Amino acid sequence: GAMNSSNYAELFNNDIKLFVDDTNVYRVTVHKTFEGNVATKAINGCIFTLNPKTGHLFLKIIHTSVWAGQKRLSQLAKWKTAEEVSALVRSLPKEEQPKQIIVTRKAMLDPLEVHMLDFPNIAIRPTELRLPFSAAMSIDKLSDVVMKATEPQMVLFNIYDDWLDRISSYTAFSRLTLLLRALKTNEESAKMILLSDPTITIKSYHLWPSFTDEQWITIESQMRDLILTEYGRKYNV
Amino acid sequence: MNTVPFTSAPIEVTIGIDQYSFNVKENQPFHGIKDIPIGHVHVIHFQHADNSSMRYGYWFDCRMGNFYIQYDPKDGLYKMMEERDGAKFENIVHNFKERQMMVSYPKIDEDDTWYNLTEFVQMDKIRKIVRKDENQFSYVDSSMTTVQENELSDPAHSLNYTVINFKSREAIRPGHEMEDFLDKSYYLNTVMLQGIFKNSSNYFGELQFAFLNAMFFGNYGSSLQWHAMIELICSSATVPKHMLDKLDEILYYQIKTLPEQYSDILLNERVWNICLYSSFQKNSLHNTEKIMENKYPELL
Ligand SMILES: O=[N+]([O-])c1cc(Cl)ccc1NCCO
Protein backbone atom coordinates (compact mmCIF):
# COMPACT_ATOMS: atom_id res chain seq x y z
CA GLY A 1 0.00 0.00 0.00
CA ALA A 2 1.07 3.54 0.84
CA MET A 3 4.48 4.69 2.04
CA ASN A 4 4.86 6.72 5.23
CA SER A 5 7.03 7.33 8.31
CA SER A 6 6.63 3.74 9.52
CA ASN A 7 8.31 2.01 6.57
CA TYR A 8 10.85 4.71 5.70
CA ALA A 9 13.89 2.42 5.63
CA GLU A 10 12.34 0.35 2.84
CA LEU A 11 13.57 3.00 0.41
CA PHE A 12 17.19 2.05 1.03
CA ASN A 13 17.01 -1.74 0.87
CA ASN A 14 18.16 -3.77 -2.14
CA ASP A 15 14.82 -4.07 -3.96
CA ILE A 16 15.10 -1.72 -6.95
CA LYS A 17 12.57 1.09 -6.71
CA LEU A 18 11.87 4.48 -8.26
CA PHE A 19 9.96 7.57 -7.06
CA VAL A 20 8.02 9.32 -9.80
CA ASP A 21 7.12 12.99 -9.40
CA ASP A 22 4.93 14.62 -12.05
CA THR A 23 4.68 18.12 -10.57
CA ASN A 24 6.94 19.72 -13.24
CA VAL A 25 5.57 17.85 -16.29
CA TYR A 26 3.05 20.53 -17.36
CA ARG A 27 4.29 24.06 -16.59
CA VAL A 28 2.62 27.25 -17.82
CA THR A 29 2.99 30.98 -17.57
CA VAL A 30 -0.33 32.78 -17.25
CA HIS A 31 -0.64 36.10 -19.06
CA LYS A 32 -3.11 38.66 -20.40
CA THR A 33 -4.20 38.70 -24.04
CA PHE A 34 -4.57 41.90 -26.06
CA GLU A 35 -8.33 41.71 -25.52
CA GLY A 36 -7.76 41.57 -21.76
CA ASN A 37 -8.56 37.87 -21.46
CA VAL A 38 -6.16 35.39 -19.85
CA ALA A 39 -4.22 32.69 -21.65
CA THR A 40 -1.53 30.22 -20.80
CA LYS A 41 1.76 29.62 -22.57
CA ALA A 42 3.30 26.26 -21.80
CA ILE A 43 7.03 25.88 -21.08
CA ASN A 44 9.18 22.79 -21.14
CA GLY A 45 8.75 20.43 -18.28
CA CYS A 46 10.26 17.23 -16.89
CA ILE A 47 9.39 13.96 -15.24
CA PHE A 48 11.44 13.43 -12.08
CA THR A 49 12.15 9.67 -11.67
CA LEU A 50 14.61 8.90 -8.93
CA ASN A 51 16.22 5.71 -7.52
CA PRO A 52 16.54 6.72 -3.84
CA LYS A 53 19.21 4.12 -3.12
CA THR A 54 21.65 4.90 -5.95
CA GLY A 55 20.77 8.54 -6.62
CA HIS A 56 20.20 7.74 -10.26
CA LEU A 57 17.83 10.36 -11.75
CA PHE A 58 16.10 9.68 -15.08
CA LEU A 59 15.08 13.18 -16.14
CA LYS A 60 12.63 12.99 -19.04
CA ILE A 61 12.34 16.40 -20.63
CA ILE A 62 8.79 17.14 -21.75
CA HIS A 63 8.96 19.50 -24.71
CA THR A 64 6.06 21.90 -25.16
CA SER A 65 5.31 20.38 -28.58
CA VAL A 66 3.79 17.37 -26.85
CA TRP A 67 0.88 19.64 -25.79
CA ALA A 68 0.19 20.99 -29.30
CA GLY A 69 -3.45 20.50 -30.26
CA GLN A 70 -4.29 18.65 -27.08
CA LYS A 71 -7.20 19.29 -24.70
CA ARG A 72 -7.36 18.82 -20.90
CA LEU A 73 -3.61 19.12 -20.51
CA SER A 74 -3.51 18.70 -16.70
CA GLN A 75 -5.13 15.28 -17.24
CA LEU A 76 -3.00 14.36 -20.26
CA ALA A 77 0.15 15.20 -18.28
CA LYS A 78 -0.53 12.38 -15.82
CA TRP A 79 -1.00 9.90 -18.68
CA LYS A 80 2.01 11.26 -20.64
CA THR A 81 4.00 10.83 -17.42
CA ALA A 82 2.77 7.25 -17.08
CA GLU A 83 3.57 6.56 -20.75
CA GLU A 84 7.18 7.80 -20.38
CA VAL A 85 7.76 5.88 -17.10
CA SER A 86 6.44 2.70 -18.71
CA ALA A 87 8.68 3.21 -21.76
CA LEU A 88 11.65 3.67 -19.38
CA VAL A 89 10.96 0.41 -17.56
CA ARG A 90 10.64 -1.35 -20.91
CA SER A 91 13.98 0.07 -22.03
CA LEU A 92 15.82 -1.24 -18.96
CA PRO A 93 17.23 -4.79 -18.74
CA LYS A 94 14.99 -7.07 -16.72
CA GLU A 95 17.38 -7.08 -13.80
CA GLU A 96 17.37 -3.25 -13.71
CA GLN A 97 13.62 -2.86 -13.79
CA PRO A 98 12.07 -1.63 -10.52
CA LYS A 99 10.14 -3.92 -8.27
CA GLN A 100 8.08 -0.96 -7.00
CA ILE A 101 7.32 2.53 -8.35
CA ILE A 102 6.19 5.07 -5.73
CA VAL A 103 4.25 8.11 -7.06
CA THR A 104 4.39 11.31 -5.12
CA ARG A 105 0.80 12.24 -6.06
CA LYS A 106 -2.16 9.91 -5.83
CA ALA A 107 -3.57 11.13 -9.19
CA MET A 108 -0.72 9.19 -10.87
CA LEU A 109 -1.75 5.77 -9.48
CA ASP A 110 -4.38 4.88 -12.09
CA PRO A 111 -2.53 6.25 -15.16
CA LEU A 112 0.60 4.36 -14.16
CA GLU A 113 -1.23 1.18 -13.15
CA VAL A 114 -2.88 1.11 -16.61
CA HIS A 115 0.35 1.78 -18.56
CA MET A 116 2.05 -0.96 -16.54
CA LEU A 117 -0.51 -3.77 -16.92
CA ASP A 118 2.20 -5.70 -18.78
CA PHE A 119 4.27 -5.64 -15.55
CA PRO A 120 1.88 -7.22 -13.03
CA ASN A 121 4.76 -7.93 -10.66
CA ILE A 122 5.69 -4.24 -10.36
CA ALA A 123 3.93 -2.66 -7.42
CA ILE A 124 2.60 0.84 -7.99
CA ARG A 125 2.33 2.66 -4.65
CA PRO A 126 1.38 6.07 -3.22
CA THR A 127 3.13 7.78 -0.29
CA GLU A 128 2.04 9.85 2.70
CA LEU A 129 5.39 11.71 2.73
CA ARG A 130 5.33 15.35 1.64
CA LEU A 131 8.41 15.10 -0.54
CA PRO A 132 9.85 18.30 -1.99
CA PHE A 133 10.60 16.96 -5.47
CA SER A 134 8.76 19.89 -7.10
CA ALA A 135 11.79 22.02 -6.22
CA ALA A 136 13.90 20.00 -8.70
CA MET A 137 13.70 22.94 -11.08
CA SER A 138 15.51 25.03 -8.50
CA ILE A 139 18.62 22.94 -9.27
CA ASP A 140 20.27 25.21 -11.83
CA LYS A 141 21.76 22.45 -13.96
CA LEU A 142 18.44 20.56 -14.19
CA SER A 143 16.47 23.73 -14.96
CA ASP A 144 19.02 24.65 -17.66
CA VAL A 145 18.77 21.37 -19.55
CA VAL A 146 14.94 21.46 -19.43
CA MET A 147 14.73 25.05 -20.71
CA LYS A 148 17.27 24.53 -23.49
CA ALA A 149 15.62 21.44 -24.94
CA THR A 150 14.25 21.79 -28.44
CA GLU A 151 12.96 18.23 -28.63
CA PRO A 152 11.98 15.41 -26.26
CA GLN A 153 15.05 14.13 -24.41
CA MET A 154 16.07 11.92 -21.52
CA VAL A 155 19.03 13.11 -19.46
CA LEU A 156 20.61 10.95 -16.73
CA PHE A 157 22.06 12.42 -13.53
CA ASN A 158 23.13 11.24 -10.12
CA ILE A 159 21.37 13.61 -7.74
CA TYR A 160 23.69 12.68 -4.87
CA ASP A 161 26.88 13.68 -6.81
CA ASP A 162 29.65 11.64 -5.13
CA TRP A 163 28.10 11.60 -1.68
CA LEU A 164 27.59 7.84 -1.43
CA ASP A 165 31.40 7.47 -1.30
CA ARG A 166 31.22 8.93 2.21
CA ILE A 167 27.63 8.57 3.52
CA SER A 168 24.82 6.04 3.37
CA SER A 169 21.82 6.36 1.02
CA TYR A 170 19.56 7.11 4.01
CA THR A 171 21.75 10.06 4.88
CA ALA A 172 22.13 11.08 1.23
CA PHE A 173 18.37 11.12 0.73
CA SER A 174 17.90 13.06 3.98
CA ARG A 175 20.34 15.71 2.76
CA LEU A 176 18.62 15.82 -0.62
CA THR A 177 15.19 16.32 0.90
CA LEU A 178 16.48 18.98 3.27
CA LEU A 179 18.07 20.92 0.40
CA LEU A 180 14.97 20.60 -1.76
CA ARG A 181 12.59 21.54 1.08
CA ALA A 182 14.74 24.64 1.64
CA LEU A 183 14.81 25.58 -2.00
CA LYS A 184 11.02 25.14 -2.04
CA THR A 185 10.40 27.36 1.00
CA ASN A 186 12.72 30.22 0.04
CA GLU A 187 14.62 29.67 -3.19
CA GLU A 188 16.73 32.83 -2.97
CA SER A 189 17.94 32.28 0.59
CA ALA A 190 18.50 28.58 -0.11
CA LYS A 191 20.63 29.40 -3.16
CA MET A 192 22.51 32.12 -1.27
CA ILE A 193 23.41 29.55 1.41
CA LEU A 194 24.76 27.13 -1.17
CA LEU A 195 26.94 29.54 -3.15
CA SER A 196 27.93 32.32 -0.74
CA ASP A 197 31.52 31.04 -0.59
CA PRO A 198 33.12 31.17 -4.06
CA THR A 199 36.01 28.91 -3.01
CA ILE A 200 33.61 25.92 -2.96
CA THR A 201 32.61 25.08 -6.50
CA ILE A 202 30.30 22.73 -8.35
CA LYS A 203 32.27 20.25 -10.41
CA SER A 204 31.32 20.12 -14.06
CA TYR A 205 30.00 16.55 -13.55
CA HIS A 206 27.96 17.45 -10.42
CA LEU A 207 24.82 19.32 -9.38
CA TRP A 208 25.78 20.58 -5.93
CA PRO A 209 28.95 22.17 -4.57
CA SER A 210 32.02 20.23 -3.43
CA PHE A 211 31.58 20.55 0.34
CA THR A 212 33.70 18.79 2.92
CA ASP A 213 31.92 16.79 5.63
CA GLU A 214 32.36 19.73 8.00
CA GLN A 215 31.04 22.22 5.44
CA TRP A 216 28.00 20.04 4.81
CA ILE A 217 27.13 20.06 8.51
CA THR A 218 27.32 23.85 8.48
CA ILE A 219 25.29 23.95 5.27
CA GLU A 220 22.72 21.46 6.58
CA SER A 221 22.41 23.53 9.75
CA GLN A 222 21.81 26.71 7.75
CA MET A 223 19.08 25.04 5.68
CA ARG A 224 17.26 23.97 8.85
CA ASP A 225 17.45 27.50 10.27
CA LEU A 226 16.04 28.75 6.95
CA ILE A 227 13.19 26.24 7.05
CA LEU A 228 12.41 27.04 10.69
CA THR A 229 12.71 30.76 9.87
CA GLU A 230 10.31 30.86 6.91
CA TYR A 231 7.96 28.83 9.09
CA GLY A 232 7.88 31.73 11.56
CA ARG A 233 7.75 34.50 8.96
CA LYS A 234 4.86 32.48 7.53
CA TYR A 235 2.85 31.80 10.69
CA ASN A 236 4.24 34.57 12.91
CA VAL A 237 5.81 32.58 15.77
CA MET B 1 -50.43 -21.28 -16.13
CA ASN B 2 -48.16 -23.84 -14.40
CA THR B 3 -47.71 -25.22 -10.89
CA VAL B 4 -44.85 -26.05 -8.52
CA PRO B 5 -46.45 -28.90 -5.85
CA PHE B 6 -44.57 -29.03 -2.51
CA THR B 7 -44.39 -32.49 -0.92
CA SER B 8 -44.91 -30.67 2.42
CA ALA B 9 -43.64 -27.83 4.64
CA PRO B 10 -41.89 -29.46 7.64
CA ILE B 11 -40.01 -26.36 8.79
CA GLU B 12 -41.24 -22.80 9.16
CA VAL B 13 -40.01 -20.73 6.21
CA THR B 14 -40.57 -17.54 4.31
CA ILE B 15 -41.16 -18.55 0.68
CA GLY B 16 -40.41 -16.21 -2.22
CA ILE B 17 -41.86 -16.48 -5.70
CA ASP B 18 -40.44 -13.79 -7.97
CA GLN B 19 -41.07 -10.44 -6.22
CA TYR B 20 -43.70 -11.88 -3.90
CA SER B 21 -43.29 -13.64 -0.56
CA PHE B 22 -45.35 -15.30 2.16
CA ASN B 23 -44.80 -17.11 5.46
CA VAL B 24 -45.39 -20.83 5.94
CA LYS B 25 -45.58 -22.17 9.52
CA GLU B 26 -43.91 -25.41 10.62
CA ASN B 27 -45.92 -28.38 9.30
CA GLN B 28 -48.63 -26.09 7.89
CA PRO B 29 -50.66 -27.91 5.19
CA PHE B 30 -48.98 -26.15 2.27
CA HIS B 31 -48.65 -27.94 -1.06
CA GLY B 32 -47.25 -25.33 -3.38
CA ILE B 33 -47.80 -22.51 -5.85
CA LYS B 34 -50.21 -22.46 -8.76
CA ASP B 35 -51.13 -20.16 -11.66
CA ILE B 36 -47.47 -19.36 -12.42
CA PRO B 37 -47.28 -17.35 -15.65
CA ILE B 38 -45.82 -19.34 -18.50
CA GLY B 39 -43.36 -17.52 -20.68
CA HIS B 40 -41.04 -16.03 -18.07
CA VAL B 41 -38.27 -17.44 -15.99
CA HIS B 42 -39.13 -17.55 -12.30
CA VAL B 43 -37.30 -17.86 -9.02
CA ILE B 44 -38.62 -19.63 -5.98
CA HIS B 45 -36.66 -18.85 -2.85
CA PHE B 46 -36.41 -19.52 0.84
CA GLN B 47 -35.42 -18.14 4.22
CA HIS B 48 -35.85 -20.44 7.18
CA ALA B 49 -37.48 -18.92 10.22
CA ASP B 50 -34.92 -20.44 12.58
CA ASN B 51 -31.83 -19.30 10.67
CA SER B 52 -32.19 -16.27 8.43
CA SER B 53 -28.63 -17.12 7.40
CA MET B 54 -28.55 -18.53 3.88
CA ARG B 55 -31.29 -17.24 1.63
CA TYR B 56 -31.35 -19.79 -1.20
CA GLY B 57 -33.56 -20.59 -4.18
CA TYR B 58 -34.09 -22.04 -7.65
CA TRP B 59 -34.32 -20.32 -11.03
CA PHE B 60 -36.60 -22.21 -13.39
CA ASP B 61 -38.78 -22.10 -16.48
CA CYS B 62 -41.92 -24.25 -16.37
CA ARG B 63 -41.74 -24.92 -20.08
CA MET B 64 -38.58 -26.97 -19.50
CA GLY B 65 -40.15 -29.64 -17.28
CA ASN B 66 -42.40 -30.46 -14.31
CA PHE B 67 -40.77 -29.30 -11.11
CA TYR B 68 -41.75 -29.78 -7.45
CA ILE B 69 -40.18 -28.91 -4.09
CA GLN B 70 -39.56 -31.47 -1.29
CA TYR B 71 -37.78 -30.72 2.01
CA ASP B 72 -34.60 -32.73 2.60
CA PRO B 73 -34.15 -33.41 6.34
CA LYS B 74 -30.55 -34.57 5.84
CA ASP B 75 -29.34 -31.52 3.91
CA GLY B 76 -31.90 -29.36 5.68
CA LEU B 77 -33.33 -27.47 2.82
CA TYR B 78 -36.20 -27.27 0.41
CA LYS B 79 -34.99 -28.91 -2.78
CA MET B 80 -36.26 -28.48 -6.33
CA MET B 81 -36.61 -31.69 -8.27
CA GLU B 82 -37.91 -32.72 -11.67
CA GLU B 83 -40.73 -35.32 -12.11
CA ARG B 84 -40.21 -37.03 -15.50
CA ASP B 85 -43.49 -39.01 -15.28
CA GLY B 86 -45.87 -36.39 -16.64
CA ALA B 87 -49.00 -38.34 -15.78
CA LYS B 88 -47.83 -38.93 -12.18
CA PHE B 89 -47.31 -35.14 -11.88
CA GLU B 90 -50.64 -33.98 -13.38
CA ASN B 91 -52.30 -36.49 -11.04
CA ILE B 92 -50.38 -35.20 -8.00
CA VAL B 93 -51.17 -31.56 -8.84
CA HIS B 94 -54.87 -32.07 -9.52
CA ASN B 95 -55.41 -33.64 -6.09
CA PHE B 96 -53.72 -30.70 -4.32
CA LYS B 97 -55.68 -28.12 -6.39
CA GLU B 98 -59.05 -29.77 -5.68
CA ARG B 99 -58.23 -29.63 -1.95
CA GLN B 100 -57.06 -25.97 -2.34
CA MET B 101 -53.72 -26.49 -0.64
CA MET B 102 -51.89 -24.06 -2.96
CA VAL B 103 -51.20 -20.33 -3.03
CA SER B 104 -51.95 -18.58 -6.29
CA TYR B 105 -49.28 -16.55 -8.03
CA PRO B 106 -50.93 -13.19 -7.47
CA LYS B 107 -50.35 -11.37 -10.72
CA ILE B 108 -52.28 -8.12 -10.96
CA ASP B 109 -53.26 -7.55 -14.59
CA GLU B 110 -51.84 -3.99 -14.78
CA ASP B 111 -48.54 -5.35 -13.48
CA ASP B 112 -45.59 -5.79 -15.84
CA THR B 113 -43.06 -5.60 -13.00
CA TRP B 114 -41.80 -9.15 -13.40
CA TYR B 115 -41.63 -8.94 -17.20
CA ASN B 116 -39.71 -5.66 -16.92
CA LEU B 117 -37.17 -7.24 -14.52
CA THR B 118 -36.61 -10.42 -16.57
CA GLU B 119 -37.11 -9.20 -20.16
CA PHE B 120 -33.69 -10.38 -21.35
CA VAL B 121 -33.15 -13.25 -18.90
CA GLN B 122 -33.15 -16.71 -20.50
CA MET B 123 -32.87 -20.05 -18.67
CA ASP B 124 -30.25 -21.35 -21.10
CA LYS B 125 -27.98 -18.42 -20.23
CA ILE B 126 -28.65 -18.80 -16.48
CA ARG B 127 -27.52 -22.42 -16.72
CA LYS B 128 -24.19 -21.25 -18.14
CA ILE B 129 -23.61 -18.82 -15.27
CA VAL B 130 -24.73 -21.46 -12.70
CA ARG B 131 -23.03 -24.70 -13.75
CA LYS B 132 -24.94 -27.85 -12.77
CA ASP B 133 -25.92 -29.49 -16.02
CA GLU B 134 -27.77 -32.53 -14.65
CA ASN B 135 -30.66 -30.23 -13.65
CA GLN B 136 -32.84 -27.87 -15.71
CA PHE B 137 -33.28 -25.45 -12.82
CA SER B 138 -30.48 -23.48 -11.13
CA TYR B 139 -29.70 -23.19 -7.41
CA VAL B 140 -28.32 -19.92 -6.01
CA ASP B 141 -27.73 -18.70 -2.45
CA SER B 142 -26.34 -15.73 -0.49
CA SER B 143 -22.84 -17.13 -0.06
CA MET B 144 -21.97 -18.34 -3.57
CA THR B 145 -18.91 -16.51 -4.89
CA THR B 146 -18.28 -15.39 -8.46
CA VAL B 147 -15.48 -16.55 -10.76
CA GLN B 148 -13.78 -13.16 -10.43
CA GLU B 149 -14.07 -13.28 -6.64
CA ASN B 150 -12.29 -16.66 -6.67
CA GLU B 151 -9.46 -14.94 -8.56
CA LEU B 152 -9.01 -12.21 -5.93
CA SER B 153 -13.03 -21.19 -3.72
CA ASP B 154 -15.06 -24.18 -4.94
CA PRO B 155 -15.44 -23.66 -8.72
CA ALA B 156 -18.44 -26.01 -9.03
CA HIS B 157 -20.48 -23.80 -6.67
CA SER B 158 -19.53 -20.51 -8.33
CA LEU B 159 -21.41 -17.86 -10.27
CA ASN B 160 -19.64 -17.77 -13.65
CA TYR B 161 -20.54 -14.23 -14.58
CA THR B 162 -18.61 -12.52 -17.36
CA VAL B 163 -15.46 -11.03 -15.88
CA ILE B 164 -15.29 -7.25 -16.25
CA ASN B 165 -12.21 -5.44 -15.01
CA PHE B 166 -11.47 -1.88 -16.07
CA LYS B 167 -7.72 -2.19 -15.33
CA SER B 168 -7.04 -5.30 -17.37
CA ARG B 169 -5.30 -5.91 -20.67
CA GLU B 170 -8.65 -7.04 -22.04
CA ALA B 171 -10.11 -3.62 -21.31
CA ILE B 172 -7.11 -1.59 -22.49
CA ARG B 173 -5.57 -1.60 -25.98
CA PRO B 174 -1.79 -1.05 -26.14
CA GLY B 175 -1.21 2.55 -27.14
CA HIS B 176 -4.76 3.66 -26.25
CA GLU B 177 -4.23 3.43 -22.49
CA MET B 178 -5.70 6.83 -21.62
CA GLU B 179 -8.28 6.76 -24.37
CA ASP B 180 -9.61 3.35 -23.41
CA PHE B 181 -9.55 3.98 -19.66
CA LEU B 182 -11.47 7.26 -19.81
CA ASP B 183 -13.84 6.20 -22.64
CA LYS B 184 -14.62 2.48 -22.42
CA SER B 185 -16.50 2.24 -25.74
CA TYR B 186 -13.95 -0.23 -27.16
CA TYR B 187 -14.34 -2.57 -24.20
CA LEU B 188 -18.15 -2.34 -24.26
CA ASN B 189 -18.76 -2.52 -27.99
CA THR B 190 -15.91 -4.58 -29.47
CA VAL B 191 -14.69 -6.71 -26.56
CA MET B 192 -17.89 -7.40 -24.65
CA LEU B 193 -20.83 -6.88 -27.02
CA GLN B 194 -19.35 -8.04 -30.32
CA GLY B 195 -16.81 -10.36 -28.73
CA ILE B 196 -18.34 -12.11 -25.76
CA PHE B 197 -22.06 -11.44 -25.42
CA LYS B 198 -22.75 -11.29 -29.17
CA ASN B 199 -25.61 -8.81 -28.63
CA SER B 200 -27.13 -6.34 -26.17
CA SER B 201 -29.89 -8.73 -25.19
CA ASN B 202 -27.46 -11.26 -23.71
CA TYR B 203 -25.64 -8.38 -21.98
CA PHE B 204 -28.83 -7.02 -20.45
CA GLY B 205 -29.87 -10.53 -19.49
CA GLU B 206 -26.76 -11.10 -17.37
CA LEU B 207 -27.16 -7.63 -15.86
CA GLN B 208 -30.75 -8.37 -14.96
CA PHE B 209 -29.87 -11.76 -13.49
CA ALA B 210 -27.06 -10.21 -11.46
CA PHE B 211 -29.47 -7.63 -9.99
CA LEU B 212 -32.06 -10.24 -9.14
CA ASN B 213 -29.56 -12.49 -7.31
CA ALA B 214 -28.28 -9.46 -5.38
CA MET B 215 -31.80 -8.39 -4.34
CA PHE B 216 -33.30 -11.79 -3.55
CA PHE B 217 -30.26 -13.50 -1.99
CA GLY B 218 -28.10 -10.55 -0.94
CA ASN B 219 -25.38 -12.16 -3.04
CA TYR B 220 -22.59 -9.61 -2.82
CA GLY B 221 -20.76 -10.84 -5.93
CA SER B 222 -23.92 -10.42 -7.99
CA SER B 223 -24.25 -6.88 -6.72
CA LEU B 224 -20.68 -6.20 -7.82
CA GLN B 225 -21.48 -7.60 -11.26
CA TRP B 226 -24.69 -5.55 -11.65
CA HIS B 227 -22.81 -2.34 -10.88
CA ALA B 228 -19.85 -3.23 -13.12
CA MET B 229 -22.11 -3.75 -16.11
CA ILE B 230 -23.92 -0.44 -15.53
CA GLU B 231 -20.67 1.45 -15.09
CA LEU B 232 -19.21 -0.05 -18.27
CA ILE B 233 -22.10 1.35 -20.28
CA CYS B 234 -22.22 4.64 -18.44
CA SER B 235 -18.44 5.09 -18.93
CA SER B 236 -18.66 4.54 -22.71
CA ALA B 237 -18.96 7.68 -24.82
CA THR B 238 -20.36 5.67 -27.75
CA VAL B 239 -23.39 3.50 -27.02
CA PRO B 240 -26.24 2.59 -29.43
CA LYS B 241 -29.23 4.81 -28.76
CA HIS B 242 -31.52 1.81 -28.26
CA MET B 243 -29.27 0.36 -25.56
CA LEU B 244 -29.33 3.60 -23.61
CA ASP B 245 -33.08 3.81 -23.90
CA LYS B 246 -33.44 0.20 -22.76
CA LEU B 247 -30.86 0.53 -19.99
CA ASP B 248 -32.88 3.47 -18.63
CA GLU B 249 -35.99 1.32 -18.52
CA ILE B 250 -34.29 -1.72 -17.04
CA LEU B 251 -32.73 0.24 -14.19
CA TYR B 252 -35.89 2.25 -13.55
CA TYR B 253 -37.79 -0.93 -12.75
CA GLN B 254 -34.92 -2.33 -10.69
CA ILE B 255 -34.78 0.82 -8.59
CA LYS B 256 -38.57 0.84 -8.35
CA THR B 257 -38.61 -2.71 -6.99
CA LEU B 258 -35.69 -2.54 -4.56
CA PRO B 259 -36.83 -2.65 -0.91
CA GLU B 260 -36.59 0.87 0.47
CA GLN B 261 -34.73 -0.40 3.54
CA TYR B 262 -32.09 -2.39 1.62
CA SER B 263 -30.91 0.57 -0.46
CA ASP B 264 -27.94 1.14 1.84
CA ILE B 265 -26.25 -2.19 1.04
CA LEU B 266 -27.40 -2.87 -2.52
CA LEU B 267 -26.60 0.52 -4.09
CA ASN B 268 -23.01 1.64 -4.61
CA GLU B 269 -22.94 5.39 -4.01
CA ARG B 270 -19.85 5.91 -6.15
CA VAL B 271 -21.16 4.05 -9.19
CA TRP B 272 -24.57 5.71 -9.08
CA ASN B 273 -23.32 9.24 -8.57
CA ILE B 274 -20.75 8.70 -11.31
CA CYS B 275 -23.28 7.21 -13.72
CA LEU B 276 -25.97 9.81 -13.21
CA TYR B 277 -23.88 12.94 -12.70
CA SER B 278 -20.35 12.49 -14.14
CA SER B 279 -20.37 9.87 -16.89
CA PHE B 280 -20.78 10.29 -20.63
CA GLN B 281 -24.33 8.98 -20.17
CA LYS B 282 -25.25 11.35 -17.30
CA ASN B 283 -27.99 12.94 -19.43
CA SER B 284 -29.27 9.74 -21.04
CA LEU B 285 -31.05 7.96 -18.17
CA HIS B 286 -33.94 10.31 -17.47
CA ASN B 287 -36.31 7.80 -15.99
CA THR B 288 -33.69 6.18 -13.79
CA GLU B 289 -32.33 9.54 -12.58
CA LYS B 290 -35.84 10.78 -11.68
CA ILE B 291 -36.79 7.75 -9.59
CA MET B 292 -33.34 7.69 -7.92
CA GLU B 293 -33.56 11.37 -6.92
CA ASN B 294 -37.09 11.08 -5.55
CA LYS B 295 -36.64 7.76 -3.76
CA TYR B 296 -32.97 7.80 -2.63
CA PRO B 297 -31.72 11.41 -2.65
CA GLU B 298 -29.57 10.64 0.41
CA LEU B 299 -27.32 8.41 -1.69
CA LEU B 300 -26.80 11.41 -3.97
O1 LIG C 1 -44.19 -36.80 -8.66
N1 LIG C 1 -44.41 -35.72 -8.30
O2 LIG C 1 -44.88 -34.91 -9.01
C1 LIG C 1 -44.10 -35.40 -6.96
C2 LIG C 1 -44.68 -34.23 -6.47
C3 LIG C 1 -44.69 -34.08 -5.14
CL1 LIG C 1 -45.36 -32.70 -4.45
C4 LIG C 1 -44.14 -35.03 -4.30
C5 LIG C 1 -43.52 -36.14 -4.79
C6 LIG C 1 -43.47 -36.34 -6.16
N2 LIG C 1 -42.76 -37.37 -6.70
C7 LIG C 1 -42.00 -38.31 -5.87
C8 LIG C 1 -40.91 -39.03 -6.71
O3 LIG C 1 -41.56 -40.10 -7.34
Swiss-Prot record, chain A:
Organism: Saccharomyces cerevisiae (strain ATCC 204508 / S288c)
Protein name, per record: Pre-mRNA-splicing factor 8
Region RNase H homology domain: start-end pairs: 7-237
Cell location: Nucleus
General remark: Present with 468 molecules/cell in log phase SD medium.
Domain of life: Eukaryota
Function in brief: Functions as a scaffold that mediates the ordered assembly of spliceosomal proteins and snRNAs. Required for association of BRR2 with the spliceosomal U5 snRNP, and the subsequent assembly of the U4/U6-U5 tri-snRNP complex. Functions as a scaffold that positions spliceosomal U2, U5 and U6 snRNAs at splice sites on pre-mRNA substrates, so that splicing can occur. Interacts with both the 5' and the 3' splice site, as well as the branch region. Has a role in branch site-3' splice site selection. Associates with the branch site-3' splice 3'-exon region. Also has a role in cell cycle.
Impact after mutating residue 21 to N: Reduced growth at 30 degrees Celsius. Strongly reduced growth at 16 degrees Celsius
Entry remark concerning the domains of this protein: The MPN (JAB/Mov34) domain has structural similarity with deubiquitinating enzymes, but lacks the residues that would bind the catalytic metal ion. Contains a region with structural similarity to reverse transcriptase, presenting the classical thumb, fingers and palm architecture, but lacks enzyme activity, since the essential metal-binding residues are not conserved.
Result of altering residue 104 to A: Reduced growth at 30 degrees Celsius. Strongly reduced growth at 16 degrees Celsius
Assembly: Component of the U4/U6-U5 tri-snRNP complex composed of the U4, U6 and U5 snRNAs and at least PRP3, PRP4, PRP6, PRP8, PRP18, PRP31, PRP38, SNU13, SNU23, SNU66, SNU114, SPP381, SMB1, SMD1, SMD2, SMD3, SMX2, SMX3, LSM2, LSM3, LSM4, LSM5, LSM6, LSM7, LSM8, BRR2 and DIB1.
Effect of residue 21 to A: Alters protein folding. Severely impaired growth. Strongly reduced growth at 35 degrees Celsius
Effect of residue 105 to K: Severely impaired growth. Reduced growth at 30 degrees Celsius. Strongly reduced growth at 16 degrees Celsius
Coverage span on the entire protein: 1836 to 2069 of 2413
Swiss-Prot record, chain B:
UniProt entry keywords in alphabetical sequence: Cytoplasm, mRNA processing, mRNA splicing, Nucleus, Phosphoprotein
Phosphothreonine sites (modified residues): 257
Effect of residue 236 to A: No effect on interaction with PRP8
Modified residues annotated as Phosphoserine in this record: 236
Main location: cytoplasm
Compartments where located: Cytoplasm; Nucleus
One Pfam family from the record: AAR2_1st
Region (Leucine-zipper): 244-265
PTM per Swiss-Prot/TrEMBL: Phosphorylated on serine and tyrosine residues.
Keyword Nucleus (UniProt): yes
GO biological process, one term: spliceosomal tri-snRNP complex assembly
GO cellular component, as recorded: cytoplasm; U5 snRNP
InterPro entries found in the cross-reference section: AAR2 (IPR007946), AAR2_C (IPR033648), AAR2_C_sf (IPR038514), Aar2_N (IPR033647), AAR2_N_sf (IPR038516)
Protein family (similarity comment): Belongs to the AAR2 family.
Further remarks about this protein from its record: Present with 7330 molecules/cell in log phase SD medium.
Main function: Component of the U5 snRNP complex that is required for spliceosome assembly and for pre-mRNA splicing. Involved in splicing pre-mRNA of the A1 cistron and other genes that are important for cell growth.
Assembly mode: Heterodimer. Interacts with PRP8 (via RNase H homology domain and MPN domain), competing with BRR2 for the same binding site. Component of a U5 snRNP complex that contains at least the U5 snRNA, PRP8, SNU114, AAR2, SMB1, SMD1, SMD2, SMD3, SME1, SMX2 and SMX3, but is not a component of the U4/U6-U5 tri-snRNP complex.
The protein's name: A1 cistron-splicing factor AAR2
Provenance organism: Saccharomyces cerevisiae (strain ATCC 204508 / S288c)
